[PDB]
Design an enzyme around this catalytic site. Structure first.
Site, PDB file in Angstrom:
ATOM      1  N   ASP A   1     -47.301  20.540  74.758  1.00  0.00           N
ATOM      2  CA  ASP A   1     -46.398  20.064  75.856  1.00  0.00           C
ATOM      3  C   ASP A   1     -47.284  19.636  77.037  1.00  0.00           C
ATOM      4  O   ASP A   1     -47.190  18.488  77.535  1.00  0.00           O
ATOM      5  CB  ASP A   1     -45.366  21.114  76.301  1.00  0.00           C
ATOM      6  CG  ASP A   1     -45.942  22.524  76.540  1.00  0.00           C
ATOM      7  OD1 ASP A   1     -47.101  22.858  76.115  1.00  0.00           O
ATOM      8  OD2 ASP A   1     -45.016  23.205  77.133  1.00  0.00           O
TER       9      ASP A   1
ATOM     10  N   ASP B   1     -49.025  13.333  65.038  1.00  0.00           N
ATOM     11  CA  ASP B   1     -48.013  12.285  65.011  1.00  0.00           C
ATOM     12  C   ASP B   1     -47.524  11.909  66.396  1.00  0.00           C
ATOM     13  O   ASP B   1     -47.475  10.704  66.822  1.00  0.00           O
ATOM     14  CB  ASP B   1     -46.855  12.672  64.113  1.00  0.00           C
ATOM     15  CG  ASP B   1     -45.728  11.655  64.129  1.00  0.00           C
ATOM     16  OD1 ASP B   1     -46.108  10.520  63.676  1.00  0.00           O
ATOM     17  OD2 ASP B   1     -44.578  11.973  64.453  1.00  0.00           O
TER      18      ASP B   1
ATOM     19  N   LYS C   1     -49.831  24.940  69.608  1.00  0.00           N
ATOM     20  CA  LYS C   1     -48.803  25.637  70.354  1.00  0.00           C
ATOM     21  C   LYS C   1     -48.950  27.153  70.074  1.00  0.00           C
ATOM     22  O   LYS C   1     -48.050  27.813  69.472  1.00  0.00           O
ATOM     23  CB  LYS C   1     -47.348  25.143  70.049  1.00  0.00           C
ATOM     24  CG  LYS C   1     -46.314  25.695  70.970  1.00  0.00           C
ATOM     25  CD  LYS C   1     -46.241  25.006  72.395  1.00  0.00           C
ATOM     26  CE  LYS C   1     -45.182  25.674  73.288  1.00  0.00           C
ATOM     27  NZ  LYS C   1     -45.075  25.158  74.611  1.00  0.00           N
TER      28      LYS C   1
ATOM     29  N   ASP D   1     -49.055   8.685  69.131  1.00  0.00           N
ATOM     30  CA  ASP D   1     -48.099   7.621  69.577  1.00  0.00           C
ATOM     31  C   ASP D   1     -48.122   7.506  71.117  1.00  0.00           C
ATOM     32  O   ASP D   1     -48.199   6.355  71.675  1.00  0.00           O
ATOM     33  CB  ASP D   1     -46.695   7.848  69.089  1.00  0.00           C
ATOM     34  CG  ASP D   1     -46.324   6.948  67.887  1.00  0.00           C
ATOM     35  OD1 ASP D   1     -45.050   6.838  67.834  1.00  0.00           O
ATOM     36  OD2 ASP D   1     -47.252   6.467  67.190  1.00  0.00           O
TER      37      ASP D   1
ATOM     38  N   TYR E   1     -45.088  18.914  57.277  1.00  0.00           N
ATOM     39  CA  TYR E   1     -44.739  17.704  56.491  1.00  0.00           C
ATOM     40  C   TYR E   1     -44.536  17.994  55.013  1.00  0.00           C
ATOM     41  O   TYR E   1     -43.589  17.427  54.400  1.00  0.00           O
ATOM     42  CB  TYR E   1     -45.821  16.672  56.608  1.00  0.00           C
ATOM     43  CG  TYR E   1     -45.627  15.818  57.887  1.00  0.00           C
ATOM     44  CD1 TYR E   1     -45.585  16.356  59.179  1.00  0.00           C
ATOM     45  CD2 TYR E   1     -45.510  14.408  57.778  1.00  0.00           C
ATOM     46  CE1 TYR E   1     -45.395  15.545  60.284  1.00  0.00           C
ATOM     47  CE2 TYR E   1     -45.359  13.619  58.939  1.00  0.00           C
ATOM     48  CZ  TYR E   1     -45.290  14.172  60.119  1.00  0.00           C
ATOM     49  OH  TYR E   1     -45.099  13.410  61.263  1.00  0.00           O
TER      50      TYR E   1
HETATM   51  C1  LIG Z   1     -43.017   7.275  58.968  1.00  0.00           C
HETATM   52  C2  LIG Z   1     -43.448   8.711  59.324  1.00  0.00           C
HETATM   53  C3  LIG Z   1     -43.197   9.606  58.089  1.00  0.00           C
HETATM   54  C4  LIG Z   1     -44.875   8.710  59.818  1.00  0.00           C
HETATM   55  C5  LIG Z   1     -45.372  10.178  60.172  1.00  0.00           C
HETATM   56  O1  LIG Z   1     -44.520  10.969  60.654  1.00  0.00           O
HETATM   57  O2  LIG Z   1     -46.597  10.373  59.898  1.00  0.00           O
HETATM   58  C6  LIG Z   1     -45.213   7.771  61.020  1.00  0.00           C
HETATM   59  O3  LIG Z   1     -44.488   8.220  62.158  1.00  0.00           O
HETATM   60  C7  LIG Z   1     -46.696   7.680  61.198  1.00  0.00           C
HETATM   61  O4  LIG Z   1     -47.150   8.108  62.294  1.00  0.00           O
HETATM   62  O5  LIG Z   1     -47.538   7.207  60.364  1.00  0.00           O
HETATM   63  C1  LIG Z   2     -44.533  29.451  77.497  1.00  0.00           C
HETATM   64  C2  LIG Z   2     -43.872  28.727  76.308  1.00  0.00           C
HETATM   65  C3  LIG Z   2     -43.494  29.789  75.251  1.00  0.00           C
HETATM   66  C4  LIG Z   2     -42.715  27.888  76.796  1.00  0.00           C
HETATM   67  C5  LIG Z   2     -41.986  27.143  75.596  1.00  0.00           C
HETATM   68  O1  LIG Z   2     -42.708  26.757  74.641  1.00  0.00           O
HETATM   69  O2  LIG Z   2     -40.729  27.046  75.756  1.00  0.00           O
HETATM   70  C6  LIG Z   2     -43.015  26.843  77.918  1.00  0.00           C
HETATM   71  O3  LIG Z   2     -43.910  25.868  77.394  1.00  0.00           O
HETATM   72  C7  LIG Z   2     -41.735  26.305  78.475  1.00  0.00           C
HETATM   73  O4  LIG Z   2     -41.540  25.069  78.326  1.00  0.00           O
HETATM   74  O5  LIG Z   2     -40.832  26.966  79.088  1.00  0.00           O
HETATM   75 CL   LIG Z   3     -47.548  20.373  61.374  1.00  0.00          CL
HETATM   76 MG   LIG Z   4     -45.707   8.535  63.920  1.00  0.00          MG
HETATM   77 MG   LIG Z   5     -43.247  23.822  77.658  1.00  0.00          MG
END
Ligand SMILES: CC(C)[C@H](C(=O)O)[C@@H](O)C(=O)O
Ligand SMILES: CC(C)[C@H](C(=O)O)[C@@H](O)C(=O)O
Ligand SMILES: [Cl-]
Ligand SMILES: [Mg+2]
Ligand SMILES: [Mg+2]
Ligand SMILES: [Cl-]
Lengths: 364, 364
Positions: free
Chosen positions: A225, A249, A193, A253, A143
């Site tokens: 993921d 973030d 990650k 959500d 950020y």
């Molecule tokens: C508006 C945006 C910059 C913000 C973030 O990415 O933190 C929002 O998504 C949040 O979660 O408060």
């Molecule tokens: C293992 C990892 C590096 C990989 C990625 O991050 O692409 C996996 O999560 C995928 O989605 O194929």
């Molecule tokens: Cl980050």
């Molecule tokens: Mg957000």
């Molecule tokens: Mg993946």
């Protein structure tokens, strides 16, 4: 002396829900004998209309003079096509968080008893309940990392952003997560990650270093993921999620939507001195603005988070939380928390603020 | 001449499910008169055990000599505590994608008729169905950006990663998404974080430039945090999702879990010459390895994606896809696709490969 609050209601439903938060605050002030003074400042779209930018100098100065910021919501279709730096959300929230060093974002989310059915999860999963606190690092990572921008032209024109984290930054937010877990169900799930990012390898390493101070707390790591999948299958198995800025973030959500009850969710963004910005997790909802439809619970619980974390008034904070529990289990639900048939029973924004304030007064 | 396939089965359930994919390929080879030759190479944990690293030279060379890579799965608890660069998944997949310039990742996901109930979504949402193709940029962004690493020591020790994208990189993957949308329901949803990242501002800008070639296709933009929420509430409203590397990683995993049917999902990772790596979306599942429990459909549909995209054999590819549809609507389901009572009806890995191969033979 008096506590001083900077009130930044913003756009959309911010002012109507803020009115109910101030109403319930008046009741807590009377019941607990707290002397609190409030000053109102424009922020977001209303600041662009009234001041030509979303974070006016006088508003920034107003927040520096306060013990905390009680914040509504910013953004709306009116300003959505401005250049990105000039828009309400980016233009207000990023500089507030950077300027006040609000490195700690707390987003509590749970399925409330009786409303498990509003969750978008399969009924057998939502019946099991969940209560997941996201602790998100809010002033580091990608950020605020530099260099950030673009170079070149045409096909070879390239943009760049830099994610950076230090051990100091990771350990301060990790300590918050572990202490919060200790007060909960004693489990931290750190989300990274680390199979791709150098910042995630350092993150994972420093979280393991901080863990030695908390042998009572279980630590596990999960790839971001994977985490989006595991919160669908077993959200009852998580307690505190400890996240970098961008991953917090995203995951906070998904967890918020998994509640099905966005209008109940609040956020706290704090610095190390305990000053913070307290706001609803949801949007400005400009379509329902000015109608008395909006659920003011998230704004009201933002006021309770402010009492606890910035004002050190735990009794007043929990009295608000209990009045909200009373409304929810006593037939006082806004329209969006009702099944489409039970909708005739919807309460308005002011009916809800009146009931919650009266409950505080009655000594809930 | 013969097509040449490099077969990289990997760890866990990779070899058992690969056997069924080869069985169904034998049936397609006979029915469509295709001459295909296969060579087997170690990759992942079995490569570390047999060769001391997860991507041996001879395996890399084997893949350079092939028309495509038919890939199983890598990883398992045995190797999970090695240094990150030495582990099976990072050590195999990142260098394969970089070396072969596999910039385009396609992850098709849909709710299959009759299995809407396995989805972790609320029944009224999963009843509406969904079919969402994720097009993820796979060799740029933060995965391969430099500088990447760490400096300093102690509290001030810092790590960094750099996300970079050029207009050329964004427009090649965007063109794929728009062409795929044109063949589907004519909608691209591009997923970015343009309120924070310079790379997302360029992404959003270049996607809008590419859009002018596709006035028949609807374009919308959505922030990655919002997208994790909208896929819970209205996944039926999305067609193609166009994503950068990290955001595609995250969102394609949430969409995969939303199916409730991971064992049906395949992936294609292609370069511009149409060479690619075709694999199941799911894990190595080492707990069920060697038991005949594993669902081989994802591996079998990976073979169908390979026939279509690398081998230009569309008739053979769709004949496999239809044989899989026949198994699913004709009572041939592995254990994990059955409700816990109907479980006695589970088919084994070989029963499923036999049925799907026999269906290809019978002219489905
Ligand atoms: C508006 C945006 C910059 C913000 C973030 O990415 O933190 C929002 O998504 C949040 O979660 O408060
Ligand atoms: C293992 C990892 C590096 C990989 C990625 O991050 O692409 C996996 O999560 C995928 O989605 O194929
Ligand atoms: Cl980050
Ligand atoms: Mg957000
Ligand atoms: Mg993946
Ligand atoms: Cl990326």
């Amino acid at each position: 002396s008096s506590y001083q609050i900077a009130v930044l209601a913003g756009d959309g439903i911010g002012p109507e829900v803020m009115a109910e938060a101030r109403k319930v605050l008046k009741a807590v002030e009377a019941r607990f004998g707290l002397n609190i003074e409030y000053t109102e400042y424009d922020v977001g779209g209303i600041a662009i209309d009234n001041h030509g930018c979303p974070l006016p100098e006088a508003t920034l100065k107003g927040c520096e003079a306060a013990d905390a910021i009680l914040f509504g919501s910013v953004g709306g279709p009116k300003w959505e096509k401005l250049p990105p730096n000039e828009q309400p959300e980016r233009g207000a929230l990023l500089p507030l968080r950077g300027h006040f060093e609000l490195f700690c974002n707390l987003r509590p989310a749970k399925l409330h008893d009786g409303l498990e059915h509003m969750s978008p999860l399969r009924s057998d999963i939502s019946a099991r309940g969940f209560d997941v606190l996201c602790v998100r690092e809010l002033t580091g990572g990608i950020y605020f990392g530099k260099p950030k921008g673009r170079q070149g032209e045409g096909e070879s024109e390239e943009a760049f952003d830099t994610m950076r984290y230090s051990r100091r930054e990771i350990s301060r937010i990790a300590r918050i997560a572990f202490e919060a877990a200790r007060g909960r169900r004693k489990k931290v799930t750190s989300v990274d990650k680390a199979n791709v990012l150098a910042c995630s390898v350092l993150w994972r390493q420093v979280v393991e270093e901080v863990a030695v101070d908390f042998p009572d707390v279980e630590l596990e790591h999960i790839y971001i993921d994977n985490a989006t999948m595991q919160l669908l299958r077993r959200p009852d198995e998580f307690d505190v999620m400890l996240c970098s800025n961008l991953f917090g973030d995203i995951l906070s959500d998904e967890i918020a939507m998994l509640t099905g009850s966005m209008g109940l969710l609040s956020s706290a963004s704090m610095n190390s001195t305990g000053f913070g910005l307290f706001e609803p997790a949801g949007g400005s909802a400009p379509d329902i603005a000015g109608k008395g439809i909006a659920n003011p619970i998230a704004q009201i619980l933002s006021a309770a988070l402010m009492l606890r974390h910035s004002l050190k008034q735990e009794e007043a904070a929990s009295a608000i939380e209990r009045a909200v529990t009373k409304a929810l289990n006593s037939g006082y639900l806004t329209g969006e928390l009702l099944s489409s048939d039970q909708r005739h029973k919807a309460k308005t924004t002011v009916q809800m603020g009146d009931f919650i304030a009266d409950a505080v007064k009655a000594g809930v």
